[PDB]
Amino acid sequence: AWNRKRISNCVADYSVLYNSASFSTFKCYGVSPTKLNDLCFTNVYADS
């Protein structure tokens, strides 16, 4: 019953996570995390 959410009209800095982030497992496909703050994304869907 995985939960799904749609996000739009906001700013998506990723460094803000690293203040207290704890992610042992990280993976990206089709994009470089470095360029994350230098791109725009039409559809943002988050599953948890």
Binding site: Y18, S22, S24, F26, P33, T34
Partner: protein, 48 residues
């Protein structure tokens, strides 16, 4: 140097991370060898 248990992936060429960008970094065409082993019995102490 000494690193944390989760940071094994960080000390490697080409990827991102706090330790690479801020503390210890390698070139994109690094040549050499990297060894990492636990030393909990060695470095840790009572009370932290």
């Amino acid at each position: 140097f000494v690193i944390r248990g989760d940071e094994v992936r960080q000390i490697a060429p080409g990827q991102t991370g706090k330790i690479a960008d801020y503390n210890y970094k390698l070139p994109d065409d690094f040549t050499g060898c990297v060894i990492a082993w636990n030393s909990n019995n060695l470095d840790s102490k009572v009370g932290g």
